[PDB]
Design a protein around this ligand. Structure first.
Ligand SMILES: *C(=O)N1C[C@H](NOS(=O)(=O)O)CC[C@H]1C(=O)NO[C@H]1CCNC1
Length: 259
């Protein structure tokens, strides 16, 4: 309708490929634009890795307090928290926090390693119901986002359904569900993304992503002031190889689906 047209104008203006999936928990409504098309998650995948460790802590009490050694060799392209902890230790709750709130790649690599590799992260998604999610590489290789490459991708619909189950559903235990929500609420990297296109009185819990071919992503659990929660997934990719980041598109996409 009006929302499908408005998003198509935005996709045309941006000169790329936009994937939008919104779920309104009040009446179970959906706004779906390229919801089945495969997009490279890049850093939005970190949620699944955090949740896999969270699901693991249900059968492993005191798991999130277990210390993990941070060495100089572990350091990759972007590690804001891990670089401050070199030749020291970080707990699994701290690595989860660093990965979700500060987008630390070394922290994400430790989460992947702890569940048994990237295939075990994909194995956890099948356990929730997600048959689209796939993690084939570790950081930093998982953010290449080459057009046509199916490695490290998911569809906006599948990620929206999965985020709904993890943050609001029964995929994780009450204690674990509360922790993921708290971490995502404490995100620092999503100010100019989805949150930028929503009013200041709305409480947002999000994860952001940035990859090759101008890939700019954001997945969010939104609490509209005084109303039932929303799940929004805004995925965006560009044709040029070193195309600059366009977080404004995600803001406009969020604005179009809510306004
Ligand atoms: C995730 O996509 N990351 C990790 C960091 N994310 O922080 S962010 O949420 O603000 O975007 C930074 C961007 C991206 C990343 O690290 N990409 O590095 C890859 C891509 C090119 N080769 C390594």
């Amino acid at each position: 309708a009006d929302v499908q047209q408005k998003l198509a104008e935005l996709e045309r203006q941006s000169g790329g490929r936009l994937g939008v999936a919104l779920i309104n928990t009040a009446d179970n409504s959906q706004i779906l634009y390229r919801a089945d098309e495969r997009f490279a998650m890049c850093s939005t995948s970190k949620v699944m890795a955090a949740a896999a460790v969270l699901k693991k802590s249900e059968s492993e009490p005191n798991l999130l307090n277990q210390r993990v050694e941070i060495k100089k060799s572990d350091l990759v392209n972007y590690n804001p928290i891990a670089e401050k902890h070199v030749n020291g230790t970080m707990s699994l709750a701290e690595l989860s926090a660093a990965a979700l709130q500060y987008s630390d790649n070394v922290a994400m690599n430790k989460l992947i390693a702890h569940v048994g590799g990237p295939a075990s992260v994909t194995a956890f998604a099948r356990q929730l119901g997600d048959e689209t999610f796939r993690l084939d590489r570790t950081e930093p290789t998982l953010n290449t986002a080459i057009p046509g490459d199916p490695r490290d991708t998911t569809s906006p619909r599948a990620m929206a359904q999965t985020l709904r189950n993890l943050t609001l559903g029964k995929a994780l235990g009450d204690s674990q569900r509360a922790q993921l929500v708290t971490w995502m609420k404490g995100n620092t990297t999503g100010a100019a993304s989805i949150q930028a296109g929503l009013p200041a009185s709305w409480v947002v819990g999000d994860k952001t992503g940035s990859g090759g071919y101008g890939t700019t992503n954001d997945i969010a659990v939104i609490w509209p002031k005084d109303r039932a929660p929303l799940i929004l997934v805004t995925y965006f990719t560009q044709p040029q190889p070193k195309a600059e980041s366009r977080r404004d598109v995600l803001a406009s996409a969020a604005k179009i689906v809510t306004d």
